[PDB]
Amino acid sequence: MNGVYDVGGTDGLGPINRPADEPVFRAEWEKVAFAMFPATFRAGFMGLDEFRFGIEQMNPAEYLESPYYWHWIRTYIHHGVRTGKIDLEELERRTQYYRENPDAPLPEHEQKPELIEFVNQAVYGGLPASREVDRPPKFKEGDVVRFSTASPKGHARRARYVRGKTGTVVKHHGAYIYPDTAGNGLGECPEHLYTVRFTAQELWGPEGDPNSSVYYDCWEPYIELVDT
Amino acid sequence: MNGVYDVGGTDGLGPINRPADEPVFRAEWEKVAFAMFPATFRAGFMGLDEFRFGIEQMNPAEYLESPYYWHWIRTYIHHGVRTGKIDLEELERRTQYYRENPDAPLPEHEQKPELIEFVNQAVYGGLPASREVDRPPKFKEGDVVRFSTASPKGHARRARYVRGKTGTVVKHHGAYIYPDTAGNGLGECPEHLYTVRFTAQELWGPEGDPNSSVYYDCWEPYIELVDT
Amino acid sequence: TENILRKSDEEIQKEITARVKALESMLIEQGILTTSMIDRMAEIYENEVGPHLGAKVVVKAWTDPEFKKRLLADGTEACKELGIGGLQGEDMMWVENTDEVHHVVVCTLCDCYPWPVLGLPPNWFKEPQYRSRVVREPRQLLKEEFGFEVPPSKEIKVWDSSSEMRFVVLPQRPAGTDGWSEEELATLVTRESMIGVEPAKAV
Amino acid sequence: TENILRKSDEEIQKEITARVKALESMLIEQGILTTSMIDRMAEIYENEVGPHLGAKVVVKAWTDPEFKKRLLADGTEACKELGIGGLQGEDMMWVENTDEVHHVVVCTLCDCYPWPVLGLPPNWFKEPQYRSRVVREPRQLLKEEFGFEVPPSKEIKVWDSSSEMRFVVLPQRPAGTDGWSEEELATLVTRESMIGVEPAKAV
Secondary structure, three states: OOOOOOOOOOOOOOOOOOOOOOOOOOOHHHHHHHHHHHHHHHHOOOOHHHHHHHHHOOOHHHHHHOOHHHHHHHHHHHHHHHOOOOOHHHHHHHHHHHHHOOOOOOOOOOOOHHHHHHHHHHHHHOOOOEEOOOOOOOOOOOOEEEEOOOOOOOOOOOOHHHOOOEEEEEEEEEEEOOHHHHOOOOOOOOEEEEEEEEEHHHHHHHHOOOOEEEEEEEEHHHEEEEEO | OOOOOOOOOOOOOOOOOOOOOOOOOOOHHHHHHHHHHHHHHHHOOOOHHHHHHHHHOOOHHHHHHOOHHHHHHHHHHHHHHHOOOOOHHHHHHHHHHHHHOOOOOOOOOOOOHHHHHHHHHHHHHOOOOEEOOOOOOOOOOOOEEEEOOOOOOOOOOOOHHHOOOEEEEEEEEEEEOOHHHHOOOOOOOOEEEEEEEEEHHHHHHHHOOOOEEEEEEEEHHHEEEEEO | OOOOOEOOHHHHHHHHHHHHHHHHHHHHHOOOOOHHHHHHHHHHHHHHOOHHHHHHHHHHHHHOHHHHHHHHHOHHHHHHOOOOOOOOOOEEEEEEOOOOEEEEEEOOOOOOOOHHHHOOOOHHHHOHHHHHHHOOOHHHHHHHHHOOOOOOOOEEEEEEOOOOEEEEEEOOOOOOOOOOOHHHHHOOOOHHHHHOOOOOOOO | OOOOOEOOHHHHHHHHHHHHHHHHHHHHHOOOOOHHHHHHHHHHHHHHOOHHHHHHHHHHHHHOHHHHHHHHHOHHHHHHOOOOOOOOOOEEEEEEOOOOEEEEEEOOOOOOOOHHHHOOOOHHHHOHHHHHHHOOOHHHHHHHHHOOOOOOOOEEEEEEOOOOEEEEEEOOOOOOOOOOOHHHHHOOOOHHHHHOOOOOOOO
16 A cells, blocks of 8 residues: 555654653543454454554545544444445444434443453463464575565555665564465465665665664565675 | 655545536635735745745645645745744734634725736746756756655655656756755756656556556756666 | 544635635735735636637647647747747647557646646646546546546556646547537547546547 | 644544444444453553563663573563563564664554553554654654754664564663662663663663
């Protein structure tokens, strides 16, 4: 996606707003949006990469100025409709109901111990994305590589500021879930993962700090050899 | 400016909204905003390049969804404050006045024949940006050139989608006002101007139409020789 | 598109109106803006300068091969022959659609547009949906938005007007118009055909 | 920033609240979401997982050179020694600030952040102002936003977490803390010092 969310290097976005302190959750609705992440994950709405792609398809003006957890709501709805698990017309009718009756009760439901077990297991065990593959790593530390200029319309982690740029492999991490398939519903198709160093001058031309570098994580198909 | 206004190649912005027809001016306020362009130009608020830079400094979420002529209002205010010709506090107080008294009269004023003469002369004579320079053109048709990777924070016409890309000079147009100085208050400093052809595949990688090219206008400092 | 953050269009218009009137009052007091100056600007671009002027050039080029040559060599000088020129078309370069080449014009960085032959641009030309996509997927954009299908084998050239040069498409003369009068052919020339987002009118 | 198009914060919150409750009611009826499940998630990240966990690693590395080695070779395995790990820090790589190198972490594409050692990120880390500028002008951003001046001759390394690898800064131990207890040193370790936007606390 060449979306506005890919903001690295963008100018004119404003000074940082940073209260001297702020709570973990600023409102009750934020706790709900947060907790719906494991809930929809477990229900098959989406995986992590698809989750991000849903947010990348938001209206950019709304993305830029809305509360962060509203982005999560948007992606839950995006995938609920995509999978047919959410009926939009019912949702709109209930929205108007709770606009008019904000204190009305939530539906009656039973508590589920397995959902608490899932929560605890995910929080403390994690959802590891590393995977083993049969092919060996194509690159190694010290290799000079160039970042792909492809511009897919689907999900990927190809920030525009690094495309077509040259840098040096810093580390190979093993193979991981590949966003370019996973986020587009095409499965894990894992690929070797590398960190690559780009100098600021390579990235920004003369406007770059002469003594600064950006480290960026590249899956194997993103990078092609320059100098071994 | 690496601003959001530099939208070429951005994905996710929405389908085109295009009424089957629409008036030149959708409201009276639009006629006013339009007419303030020659008025502030003549008064020394800004030139054409500075005008555009003012818009490039807008809040991006507002830029993306506001009426086009509102952008013009924003840049008039930007330069009115910059030059001290507009006092912001007075402006805010009058805004609230006309919010509360939308039918109140405008200030009493005399009509000025010279402002009508200016209008007609600009409309039919134009405001030509071409300039003569003592240096000859550095490039020529058929030259293969690469577009600069510099990323100035001030005004320039360096769309991000063409930076660092290679193309072929199509035409030299003569020398013109140079945006990178003019839009930043640094004068005309004219430079030779060229159109350069970039293939879609050069621009977008494999996602590019194999049978399509983008023509982009480059001032001399933007481009450096590859193959003569 | 929906944006849960956005006020209504009515509330937006009311606010802009107050803000513009307040700024207008200040420039009036400075002596740099007058109501007659506002009216003249609006009259010129509502009734005097419009795409009817561009259509006159097009039909002359369609019916006068020597003029067509001159138009394609220096567009500003050629249009000057018909009394057409001035603000925002001081430098005009015309590009000819053929059987092998289709041209379409955009300004991805803002809004640049040849006012002396087309008048002020329609709102869709200035907005981010067209500007963002036409440089990236011109063939699909032309078919989806304008029902204009360009065969895969035909090259599309997108002209991004990043400078004060203005690009204007000379559309191909439709078949079936042999011997038509200049007036009769002009009815086929549209704003859209001189941007390159549509062909000239069929039949 | 001002946006004449934007409703008030109160009107925005009221709308989001209704929309979230409506979606919540639907997922409840599907049997996939419960109030106990919402409460547990919120308890864990309000009171259990927070930057106090990261500070324990930091002070161990400051006081245990052998642990520091292990931390810098494989961060996930090292933190596992202290009972720290899990969701959104399954792969953790720690980078050590020195006299020659300063590290700062960002996620320009979204919001990636090492939850098991820092808890959920503060809102400024997720927002576009920090993410857009730190890769482009880290030295100026650190001085203007956080009053943190990094000498021109010192290299700044910005780590853009585009993957599931999570980068965590090991800040330099402040001078004047010889022989301090692990508890006493932890009071100097801040969330900001493990993002790289501030040093650890002076004195």
